[PDB]
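Quick one: sequence plus magnesium ion SMILES, need structure tokens.
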Amino acid sequence: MRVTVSIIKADVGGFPGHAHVHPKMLEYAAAKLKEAQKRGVIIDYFVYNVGDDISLLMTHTKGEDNKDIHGLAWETFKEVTDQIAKRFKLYGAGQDLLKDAFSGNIRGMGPQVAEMEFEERPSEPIIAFAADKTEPGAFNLPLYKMFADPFTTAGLVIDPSMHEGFIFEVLDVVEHKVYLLKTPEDAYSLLGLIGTTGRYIIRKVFRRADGAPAAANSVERLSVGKDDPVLLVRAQSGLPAVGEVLEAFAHPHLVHGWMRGSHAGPLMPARFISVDPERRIAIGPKMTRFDGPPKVGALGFQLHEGYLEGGVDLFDDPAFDYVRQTAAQIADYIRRMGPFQPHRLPPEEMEYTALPKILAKVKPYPADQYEKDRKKYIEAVVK
Amino acid sequence: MRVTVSIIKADVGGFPGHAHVHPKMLEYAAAKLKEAQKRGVIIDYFVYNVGDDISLLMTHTKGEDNKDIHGLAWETFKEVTDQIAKRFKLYGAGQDLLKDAFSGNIRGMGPQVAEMEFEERPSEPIIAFAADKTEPGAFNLPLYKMFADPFTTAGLVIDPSMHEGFIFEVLDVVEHKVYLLKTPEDAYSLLGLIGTTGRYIIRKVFRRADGAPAAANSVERLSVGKDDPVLLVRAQSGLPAVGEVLEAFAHPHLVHGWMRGSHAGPLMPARFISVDPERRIAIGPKMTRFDGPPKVGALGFQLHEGYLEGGVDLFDDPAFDYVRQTAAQIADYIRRMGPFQPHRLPPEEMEYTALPKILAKVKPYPADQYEKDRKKYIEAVVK
Amino acid sequence: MRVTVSIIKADVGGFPGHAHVHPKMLEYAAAKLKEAQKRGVIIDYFVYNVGDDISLLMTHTKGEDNKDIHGLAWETFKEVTDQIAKRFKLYGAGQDLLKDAFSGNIRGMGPQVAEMEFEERPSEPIIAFAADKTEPGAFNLPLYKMFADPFTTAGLVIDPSMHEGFIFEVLDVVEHKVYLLKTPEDAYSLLGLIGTTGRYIIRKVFRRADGAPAAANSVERLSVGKDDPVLLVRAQSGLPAVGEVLEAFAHPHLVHGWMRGSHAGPLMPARFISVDPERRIAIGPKMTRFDGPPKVGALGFQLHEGYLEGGVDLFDDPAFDYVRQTAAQIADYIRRMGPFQPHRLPPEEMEYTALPKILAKVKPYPADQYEKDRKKYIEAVVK
Amino acid sequence: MRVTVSIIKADVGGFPGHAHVHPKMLEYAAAKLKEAQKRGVIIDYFVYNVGDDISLLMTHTKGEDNKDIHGLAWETFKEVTDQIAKRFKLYGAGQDLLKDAFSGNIRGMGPQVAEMEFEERPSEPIIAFAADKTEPGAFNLPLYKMFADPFTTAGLVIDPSMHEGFIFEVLDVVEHKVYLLKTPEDAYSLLGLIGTTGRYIIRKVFRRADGAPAAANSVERLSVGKDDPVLLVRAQSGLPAVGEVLEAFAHPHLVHGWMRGSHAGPLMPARFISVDPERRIAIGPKMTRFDGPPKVGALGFQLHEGYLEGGVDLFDDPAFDYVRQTAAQIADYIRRMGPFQPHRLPPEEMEYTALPKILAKVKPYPADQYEKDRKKYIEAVVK
Amino acid sequence: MRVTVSIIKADVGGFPGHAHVHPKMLEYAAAKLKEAQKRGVIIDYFVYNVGDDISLLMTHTKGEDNKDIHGLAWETFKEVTDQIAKRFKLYGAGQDLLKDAFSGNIRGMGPQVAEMEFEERPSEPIIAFAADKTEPGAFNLPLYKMFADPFTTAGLVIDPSMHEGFIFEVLDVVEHKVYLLKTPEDAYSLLGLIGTTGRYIIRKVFRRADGAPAAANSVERLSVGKDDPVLLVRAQSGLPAVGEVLEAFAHPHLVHGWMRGSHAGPLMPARFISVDPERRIAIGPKMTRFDGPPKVGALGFQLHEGYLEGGVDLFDDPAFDYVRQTAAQIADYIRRMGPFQPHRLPPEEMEYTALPKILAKVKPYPADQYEKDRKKYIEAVVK
Ligand SMILES: [Mg+2]
Ligand SMILES: [Mg+2]
Ligand SMILES: [Mg+2]
Ligand SMILES: [Mg+2]
Ligand SMILES: [Mg+2]
Ligand SMILES: [Mg+2]
Ligand SMILES: [Mg+2]
Ligand SMILES: [Mg+2]
Ligand SMILES: [Mg+2]
Ligand SMILES: [Mg+2]
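Reply:
Sure thing.
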């Protein structure tokens, strides 16, 4: 049968500030999706957070872009906001619920969505990712690596089915344009684009042999835009092994975001604090020093008949402690830089804050004229 | 509504020696504040320790310096002392209950108090800190950093509302005098003072734009004086982000105190051993090698209608493990110094111990006369 | 009132081999001492292990060397051996129950005993230690440090009462002789002796000012002898602070024992796996690589009216993780040495194994004669 | 007397590629400035390189912007290019000699110039810096720190003369505008600007008390622009101590440039390979892995009567080996990022390379239309 | 024969600022002492620097406090100052030549002097030390360790002649008083004093068995006072082995001084840059980051008939690279503390700078009155 796997993510209230979610937020969303399950709306679900973003992972048969699945997620976010965030006066309550109405589609309303509709396989392992304190371009490098880099994904070299490579669907979020690029041949051009992570964002990957969908990352054209993305990746059987996918994250590369959406720091692959598959909830890591560093969590599932068996915390292994130690140490090195590029983002990712405003001052003197005048201009200031 | 958030801290019995508190101490204080809640005395509370100091965090509407809130905390400390510390023959039972009477105000009676009365905000995240085995000047540097250092608090550079800086209320605990200093312009003078952490202690910080209170640190003029302080900081929304506040502690600077209140060692930001928000108790870290090193704990809350939602252990993140590893290693390096300045405090912080006494011996010879006499003075000793 | 605090330790069954104890061993010993408590035999107790040695900590009023307390401990070891070790066919079941009869005193029968009888103080914090896979001389250095080294115990320099130093009771286990030495003046001679840890063993320390007992280490003259010792130390109030005592262990010095009682490795200060003060049991660390490394555990209590409030795991602090990391790394360095001095003990601690036997071969040639004969002696071997 | 100290820097030939200079380049420039000295054109000189940029440090009395000093440096660069770079077919021979004519002033012709004209002091220590493989904004942070950061320059807090702070002359290289900012009060605005290191570049610093010049960094408005800058800083006596200046560089912050002027990596403070004050030449470090990492060198002098006594390699101290080890390790971490932001510069510093060209392809599909067409667009590619 | 070994040290000109000496300074002092040798004034000499302090080590037979030896050193410092420091306009030229006249004795005129007059032994190894950027109390800990600590000097435990310990001559530089203390018995009191390194300074050590002199450290009562000390230690043969002396320095303890004589940092044991025993000169390390860290150098000699055979750089061994790496890393950790105690010295070592001056402002409000007035006092500032 054709299942649709759908992640719909939103920040609706931080506890405290931007550090974590409140757990009743999770409890209430799980309780609500359990009604929709009972009512036949969805087959299975799982509810978790990373930092302060709630992810609603849902299986169902209404396909992509569906207004009842997108509706259900909207409704269920609205209700956490009114019943809990507003109740507890949580920080940035209702943050991502930017638009107010609700046409039919949730995209470009504030929450993030990655979905894939495929025919379920004999075995169907998927990984589900969520990052906090970063932007969707943060997965551009793990995505490139796992589907295109031979040093990460051995399957590219030694598995016949992957040998032909993958199709990359790249969204230009600035000018609302899509590029289809196909590895290996187009690797250097793909990189030419996606390496500018603020603007060219891998939205979907497709297997080239049969067209099968492989991954969908959460990204929309600017206006909303995109904070803290969520990713869905399908694994094994002519698609990256689960561990080739996990390897793509073994190096905590630097991502944009961190504190005030204006700095860069290492992407730490974190453990969940607890995973309760019976109650269908997982509590992810907190964000602490400087509001991060930025973090990604990974839960793996096996789907059967649309049911979600899992999830398993896939960054839970001593091997990832080394990675975590590295990221802690880089977060520390890079922070000693204070408010300077490249620790601080370029002015354009600044432009959305309010550095510009300030510059309502100073009085700038044009250079050619100040150059024959330096001495009295300083003489002024000095007295 | 105007809430008052009030921390009132005391060491009333160590278990064993100076290492920790007994847990029934916490249990009994929580049970007691729950009566006062029921009776309408206070809106909410939370009871925790770091090392051997019990903190009673209480919300209420009686404002600062109130004799019923200060009374309640006194009463509730007295009762732990008689019912438990004295019962179990705990070490330094009733330690901080120095005075005996109880005029109206608790300050200068032994326990430490930081309170703030503000109009509650749309979202109102506060952080609550407690350090053990140090002195109130230990927060002078984290306080300076989070409100005045651009390398710590990006908000100073990129958030319009903080751009104008803060007012620092500095108490001269030695001569009972207060200095108001305002950053940025007065930074170098603020530092001139507060860098002498034994004497010029940041007691309160105020936002300069509107006068809003931002932080209150626990400090009183000498006589009592001040051990193991507690700090209250309000975050977000024109005030340091929660993570800019947590960053101010990312470097385990050296603080005075540690063993016998006479040495200096790194301030380790520690995790709580357990946080039970349902029973309103948290058990902090123990103090071990050399009676520390010194440690600070951080709990974050969101206030609604005076209710304390929390607390969240905000030093609970792999990023702070690096910091903790650093502090462990410095505690080890610096200790190899034994009883020597600067590992050992200057003589004046010694003067309150009993190095002076000793020096009831030796016989000191005046120099000018010993200089023509060295040879027979040694000839003596030798025989 | 005068309490006696009494630790009586024995290895009666390893699970598996020499790695740990079986937990019913602990359960059964706790159940048994609870009868004796009920019957008035003893005031309080606590039952724990480190590696494969069971420690019975008991409070009571029968004073030192008492035959009912020593009897109770014997009886209760015999019963674990018959009811559990023998039942489960545990390794080296009944190991330390060497003698067979039972005159009146347990010392020189196999188990280890440290006791102190003192008048209980206003506050009376004691620490209770147990090491596995080493010998009683392993505490010679922590003992020296905490009572005699100014770099460890600041109290020696800055506390008037300790300024006069301590009396060291040193047992020569080889020739059954006792030396009384008193620090500071006799430091160099104390060291001359105790630095030979296999033979001159600090058995007791006494405060010099008033004669008060301070510490008692578990040691008996050879025949039995002594494996895996237990130590009792009283803290605070003119005696080392609890943290000066814990500092004496902050450096994992090398001790004799480890694997087959014939090697040297670092003394790792370990955490307990669990501490249950309600059931009066604690499960200590396992011994793994090469049967260690060697380890010591520390539980602190506060005594009131002979009741044992505790115990607290006093090596449970991030600061001791650094120490633990160091010890892991030295255990690794030193092991690459294989069977060579000094990783391997001197021949005399070998002499109690069976290196000697072997040397029933080779044929040794006397040197003076072999020297004019080398060439044909090799010519032989070669053909 | 009023001396002018003048550094005029140029890349005129790499050996090999971009790694170093050829030593006859240095030899020939020294030989040439020795004529000009003999002829009275200049008082003293010193000739050194870092990476592949030659620095001509010259003392003289013709003041700033002088056409004979700028001429002499031009002439002497032209002659190295024709007599050596072109001779040996060195890489990028004559690179920085962009313009062809020579009006009167060297600025905006390709080479970099920092000069200061001051009255020589009783003692007059200056430091002279040169960086390779970076851009002039690389010194924005060391410059800010040494004149404005109290954590770097203790003199700001404890020296009366510096207490009043400094004037920062900031050039907007993009719109040819100058900003005068004065610390402390304007710190946050200074940072608002200079933290965008690609565009707002500290060109000069002046002491605020008397107007004295303190530092001049090498920077010109875009067209030329600016690679690998050179800095001149005066030290001591109401101006940063020599070591407060050296401290500003103790943390290898990330700078733009490195390989192909398109990446960011740590600024390594390097030693010179040799310093020959008798022949007035110093050979700086090579640039190796990935064409760096980027590096800065420091030579200190004492001026007397315009004579340059020195120079001393001021990064030659074990303390800077730690810094160097850190930078090596970051260069290694950050490089594993390949062609991705922030390791790779933002598109705008790309725009001067030729990423744009490429994008002569792919065919971009507008999003709104591709969204109802995905399936056949992939069906295409797949077949 | 009775030789006198005499070190007389002075800072007379830094190159640049405070980083090093100019080498002609050394050359000229060596040339000058070679005349005095030729003339019979002195038997042998050696001339070296550490940081910016020149040491004149001289052997001779005029005994301690001699006016011709002290004169010769004065004269020879004056001449370097006029002929070189003043010539080259070096920084702080003539710095230590504070007084102007010259009664007979050099002590309390600015330079530092350590001398010992002993009967030369069958073999007579001495070590000669010089530290820069610290104060004479910096050797208090190495001095204590090598003569009194059994963990440093094994000879105390295992060599019969040292078993009786040493006499410590302690100068109270604040009240011009001398204390004779004798180890072991007086260890704790010695420490009580010398651990306050700013005031109780070990000036001389004497062997207790025969009265022999062992060490003399450079220290005078305040007025002058004391910067950057020099130490002379005699080794072997009932006195610490050369390596027990070198061990006393194996841990880079924190010392007062560093930058602006107002901070604390690790004492790095450094190598000499070059040792030329034929020309009788050695060039020591430079001081760089933050004007240090502080450093000590060690040259060993063998005396025969007063001739100085040597010197050997005794910190030149890979084993000391570990120590040097540690010190680099601590210098880095502790510096992140900026202007705060204990990185910054206590106010009293401040009092000699000019923190006090500043505090000509702010207006301090007395506390009791400000406490009922806070709100309008902030209302003021805010408007
Ligand atoms: Mg948020
Ligand atoms: Mg978020
Ligand atoms: Mg206490
Ligand atoms: Mg306390
Ligand atoms: Mg066993
Ligand atoms: Mg055992
Ligand atoms: Mg080039
Ligand atoms: Mg270049
Ligand atoms: Mg100097
Ligand atoms: Mg000096």
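Chain C is about 25% helix and 25% strand. The two ends of chain C are 82 Å apart (CA to CA).
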